[PDB]
């Protein structure tokens, strides 16, 4: 029934401004004061603003510093969260919650809206096929992967032959090397059937809206 | 201003273990809360008011504490109780910084695989030689690089996934990146484990100058 819904976020240049919004429903939206907190790469977790009922009491948290404005319509059961002058400091997840009573711990979360400050820009991968080759492997079982470089921003989704293989995957966390994200991904497969029966990584980024698949095939050599 | 900060940062334990984890306030302070949140998701109401169990929460979870010292419980722990729990109260800004609790199990060595560069990535200039090592525990592991005789640490980096839900290992990832020139002026590639399943490490290699 509660739901709490959070859409808005996105990348923007230092300096710049963006308005979050939190749609709500299954509930009357005015009756409860409500919350903006942010959890930033290191995972952690800051009270950024608050707002009651009314929209007569507002608080902001210590490093706000004047550049946050927590807004309300209780008649569109949306709450608004605009942003001033930005740092990167700022880059978080930022979450909408919602409070129970009057020693404010916060009984529903919305699923979060992801906000990245920096002056990087928009760059789809590079997708190459990790064959054995040279260091052939001899037993029941084989491992084949998949390398994704060279993309901003986060994140990639990375499936195998379109999500039929999903048993012995490992998908690692990205890392950042100079602006730029780069991933692997492995999957073991029986020895008896590649290349028998074809194994294809499917790489997708939103960002760029970039589709590739990329077949996994042994070397001229 | 009065903050909070949280004992221990790691843990791990079999299920089956009693579990108690601390979270200590600058000055005294009142009504006490605890988040439980899960890698993707968000946080999650756990416990509030110091001892009131929000709902769909075992009754093997205990709060407590007052004044300056608070705690959180758990008899019994079960798989599903891993996760990370942050303490917050109503004065404060900044949340507790989280007990992370992991999962023990059975020690296991790494299945481990070397990938020379791809064909593709050399005609663009680059060359990454990557090493898989699955299926381990401990977390604690030990990676050594060695080109044509010498040991190498400068252009590599580590990524650990995250406790696996089905078994509870971990697996990670190893990578070598150089230029076309630097990969093409050396021939033998040798990625090694050294874990304590093993005094011995597990060794894997290739030749350049072979395919």
């Known amino acids: 029934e509660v739901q709490l819904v959070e859409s808005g976020g996105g990348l923007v240049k230092p300096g710049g401004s963006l308005k979050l919004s939190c749609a709500a429903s299954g509930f009357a939206f005015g009756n409860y004061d409500m919350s903006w907190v942010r959890q930033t790469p290191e995972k952690r977790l800051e009270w950024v603003a608050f707002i009651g009922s009314g929209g007569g009491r507002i608080y902001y948290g210590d490093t706000m510093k004047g550049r946050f404005t927590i807004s309300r319509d209780n008649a569109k059961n949306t709450l608004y969260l605009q942003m001033s002058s930005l740092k990167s400091e700022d880059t978080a997840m930022y979450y909408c919650?919602?409070?129970?009573?009057?020693?404010?711990?916060?009984?529903?979360w919305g699923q979060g809206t992801s906000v990245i400050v920096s002056s990087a820009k928009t760059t789809p991968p590079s997708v190459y096929p990790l064959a054995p080759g040279s260091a052939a492997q001899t037993n029941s079982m084989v491992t084949l992967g998949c390398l994704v470089k060279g993309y901003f921003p986060e994140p990639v989704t990375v499936t195998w032959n379109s999500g039929s293989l999903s048993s012995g995957v490992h998908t690692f966390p990205a890392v950042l090397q100079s602006d730029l994200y780069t991933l692997s991904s492995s999957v073991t497969v029986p020895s008896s059937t590649w290349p028998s029966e074809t194994v294809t990584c499917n790489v997708a980024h939103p960002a760029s809206s970039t589709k590739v698949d990329k077949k996994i095939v042994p070397r001229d050599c | 201003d009065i903050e909070l900060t949280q004992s221990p940062a790691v843990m791990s334990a079999f299920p089956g273990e009693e579990v108690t984890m601390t979270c200590s306030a600058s000055?005294?302070?009142?009504?006490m809360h605890w988040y439980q949140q899960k890698p993707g998701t968000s946080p999650k109401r756990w416990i509030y008011?110091?001892?009131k169990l929000a709902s769909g929460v075992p009754a093997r979870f205990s709060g407590s504490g007052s004044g300056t010292s608070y705690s959180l419980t758990i008899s019994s722990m079960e798989a599903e109780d891993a996760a990370t729990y942050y303490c917050?109260?109503?004065?404060?800004?900044?949340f507790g910084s989280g007990t992370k609790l992991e999962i023990k199990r059975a020690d296991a060595a790494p299945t481990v695989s070397i990938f020379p560069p791809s064909s593709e990535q050399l005609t663009s200039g680059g060359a990454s030689v990557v090493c898989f090592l699955n299926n381990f525990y401990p977390k604690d592991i030990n990676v050594k690089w060695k080109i044509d005789g010498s040991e190498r640490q400068n252009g590599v980096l580590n990524s650990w996934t995250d406790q696996d839900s089905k078994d509870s290992t971990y697996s990670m990832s190893s990578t070598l990146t150089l230029t076309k020139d630097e990969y093409e002026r050396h021939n033998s590639y040798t990625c090694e484990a050294t874990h304590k399943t093993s005094t011995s490490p597990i060794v894997k290699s290739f030749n350049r100058n072979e395919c």
């Open positions: 000055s005294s302070i009142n009504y």
């Open positions: 008011d110091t001892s």
């Open positions: 917050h109260q109503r004065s404060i800004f900044t």
């Open positions: 919650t919602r409070h129970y009573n009057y020693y404010y711990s916060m009984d529903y």
